[PDB]
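Exercise: predict the structure of this protein bound to flavin-adenine dinucleotide.
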Amino acid sequence: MRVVIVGGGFGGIAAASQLKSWAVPFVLVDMRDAFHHNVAALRASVESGFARKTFISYSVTFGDSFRQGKVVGIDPERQQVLLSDGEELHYSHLILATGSDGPFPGKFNKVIDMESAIQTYEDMVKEIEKSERILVVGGGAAGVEMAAEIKTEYPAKEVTLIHSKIALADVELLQSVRQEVKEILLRKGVRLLLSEKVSNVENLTTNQFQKDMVVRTEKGTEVVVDMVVLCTGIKINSSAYATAFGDKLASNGALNVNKHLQLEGYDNIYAIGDCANLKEPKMAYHAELHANIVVSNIINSLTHKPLKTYQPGSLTFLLSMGKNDGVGQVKGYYVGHLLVTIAKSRDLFVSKSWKTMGQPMPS
Amino acid sequence: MRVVIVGGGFGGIAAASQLKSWAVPFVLVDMRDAFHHNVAALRASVESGFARKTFISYSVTFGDSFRQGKVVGIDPERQQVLLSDGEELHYSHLILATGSDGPFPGKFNKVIDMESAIQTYEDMVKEIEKSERILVVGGGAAGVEMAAEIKTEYPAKEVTLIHSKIALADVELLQSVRQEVKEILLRKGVRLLLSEKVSNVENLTTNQFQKDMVVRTEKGTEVVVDMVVLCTGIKINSSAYATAFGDKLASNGALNVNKHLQLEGYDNIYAIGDCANLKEPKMAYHAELHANIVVSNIINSLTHKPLKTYQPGSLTFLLSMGKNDGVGQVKGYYVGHLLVTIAKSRDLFVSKSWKTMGQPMPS
Ligand SMILES: Cc1cc2nc3c(=O)[nH]c(=O)nc-3n(C[C@H](O)[C@H](O)[C@H](O)COP(=O)(O)OP(=O)(O)OC[C@H]3O[C@@H](n4cnc5c(N)ncnc54)[C@H](O)[C@@H]3O)c2cc1C
Ligand SMILES: Cc1cc2nc3c(=O)[nH]c(=O)nc-3n(C[C@H](O)[C@H](O)[C@H](O)COP(=O)(O)OP(=O)(O)OC[C@H]3O[C@@H](n4cnc5c(N)ncnc54)[C@H](O)[C@@H]3O)c2cc1C
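Solution:
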């Protein structure tokens, strides 16, 4: 028997770690040879020396249970995972944990080695350093984070953020929250260009210092900057499984699962993390909760016992998450509950990934 | 000099308590002779003996600085508060804290004495007790709370909740939260009739046990119940001030204020709580924060010093609010912050109002 995990993200490494703890045979597959703590990728593209903390070697943790490769197909009938180098991996159980993909710096999902990936982010750090004026394209989570991280490291730089909507950040967020994102950026001094769409975006020179670049919008508006960072358009990564289940995907590319996180047509394929079509926000935190359920259900499948149900609204959230302030912001109420915001821990929980991987953080 | 406060709600009693602590002369005006902890009104209409904890005598706390009356006009030029009994109260500073109004049991804003108000809720408790089947009209906060409180006290009663929208609760809440409200009610066994509008609502027999009442919807749907509770339609109470500022109100009846919570046309009128037109959710918690700012600014006005600014997103929120569980539910993220839900304390913070009023809770 063999559990194959496609995707070594937050979900995948949680599932692999747990399968190893249970001594279930498995192979974890990822394009990269290192786990990417992608939440901290924007900080890594700004703050010198930080990128080394955001990649963690898979093989050091998992040895022969890790296999680097780019999955270009899944055959659910013969139970094969098909790689871009022609090899095929049979499975008895398949966990799809393929996450979301988008432009660098926000995402870095490609076939690359750890040192080269760290050096790609370090190169970006020097380009940022060189540039007095920087445009960020995209007002979603990655763009807001990039604007904020630049102004944190370099409070005197001129940062402009352009965004096609009326308000920043994900529509599913409370507008009270969207407006607060605007106000957080304005407090840091970022200049906002909302409802404002870059024209001929494909001709931009990105991730590079270049004096006096002129960026035009569809409104004819112009700004002159020394570097352009693309933070538009993170979408669920269906590359592994599109040819097998494309006709059955949700609109956004996510996989439809039952209450046990099994794919609807199968009892031995599961989806976790962003790529599962759940009615919950796509977070690293939930990807890990999904992994617990799926590993439990693989165990129960071996033992012919009843499967566990994924309960959204897990109560396992404590002061450990967030900071130690104990402070919050009341944002609303409803039956039995209050809505609150708390500050993220400003290490962006990097240390938890090194803990999960059983590796000391770099010196 | 005299600060007149119209409305002895959460905001008004906070402002009055603080003005008394500062020894600023004031008169607090409310229709009722007792403060109503309106958050717990639905529980008070269900649980025997509980209503006595939800009304607190104004005069016991404030003596001659409280005046019962129903304000039917404000004259901002002569600086008069006009009462329905013909009397007028001059002010040097006016705080409008008029809150929101709606049907009983959710709201109880009328000229009435404390013992009669408690007895009105106790009467409702016996009508609920008598009724095996109960319809709740309205899926906003009051209706959801009424359905939940009935099924908490009487898990075997048949409770139906009818609501005109597709989903329950305030649209400004996350749909993830609206759906969770649905799931909280379904777990308690409430039968939901969504997208479903009661026909001839004015002919219903409400707040009364009556066997075999037939309720028809605009869809022709019918249900047979023994009691009907109206929880539709809490709206900002502009009765005090409509004739003075109606032309300048926001659409929902709220008052437009500047960053110091002063009414736009005046330096000596302030608005706090629900009746202030702020871009924040209307809660008792915020009404009290508004009162702090306004009292500070009245002091600063006396001393000819600069006014304080109301900063939405106050950081003064701790584990004291909520329960002691320390547990939460992660609901989302954004720059620097996580969105979380925590459980309300299940006394619905009744004890804090008695503390504010300096009165021991009833035996
Ligand atoms: C700016 C920003 C901030 C965020 N902050 C937070 C936060 O504070 N908290 C939080 O909980 N979440 C946060 N998130 C969300 C978080 O990044 C994702 O929800 C999380 O990474 C999802 O984990 P996952 O396991 O589903 O996939 P990922 O972590 O995206 O990992 C997927 C992996 O699959 C691999 N893969 C995909 N397709 C293939 C293929 N065909 N072949 C081989 N390998 C493949 C990729 O190489 C990748 O390593 C943030 C996101 C952004 C953009
Ligand atoms: C079901 C439900 C649950 C809630 N739960 C919470 C919660 O958990 N936490 C939270 O923070 N908020 C909660 N709220 C919101 C909370 O009830 C209100 O935001 C709060 O009462 C606002 O306080 P206020 O001072 O603005 O006005 P109110 O508390 O409504 O007081 C206004 C007062 O003004 C008086 N008044 C009005 N007009 C006149 C007039 N013309 N003359 C004389 N007197 C007048 C009324 O008699 C009344 O006493 C809840 C609301 C509901 C409906």
